[PDB]
Amino acid sequence: DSFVIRGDEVRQIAPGQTGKIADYNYKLPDDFTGCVIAWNSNNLDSK
Amino acid sequence: ASVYAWNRKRISNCVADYSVLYNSASFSTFKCYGVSPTKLNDLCFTNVYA
């Protein structure tokens, strides 16, 4: 699953976590098997 | 206040909309202990002290 986000919200992308992006538009299952991988993209995605 | 002389505000006889606090992106931490911040609207207290 590929998407861009504000660096503050990386914390919410986990099984059982909460807040607007996890509540609305990207929800993980509580029994998730997987990896969450993220990096700063201020050099690419900012203008 | 200064941490040597912190101020305590009693909160009582009122309705507490805790999601207005928890959703505020300005807060660098919101660590809760004997309660989870999502549950606070379902739950209530004799007093709260800030």
Task: Characterise this structure.
Chain B: This is Spike protein S1. The structure is cut from a larger assembly and holds two copies of chain A. With 47 residues, chain A is largely without helices or strands. Chain A is built from one helix and no strands. Chains A and B meet through loops of A and loops of B.
Largest sheet of chain A: none
Helix content of chain A: under 10%
What is the overall number of helices of chain A?
1
Basic shape of chain A: globular
| Number of β-strand runs of chain A | 0
Largest interface: pair, residues per side: A-B, 4 and 3 residues
Give me the strand/helix succession of chain A. H
- Radius of gyration from the alpha-carbon trace of chain A, in angstroms: 12 Å
User: What kind of assembly state do the chains in view correspond to?
Assistant: part of a larger assembly
Quote the beta fraction of chain A: under 5%
Measure the end-to-end span of chain A: 24 Å
Give the helix/strand class of chain A.
little secondary structure
PDB class: viral protein
Keywords: SARS-CoV-2 Spike Protein Trimer, viral protein
Entry title: SARS-CoV-2 RBD down Spike Protein Trimer without the P986-P987 stabilizing mutations (S-GSAS)
Chains A, B: Spike glycoprotein
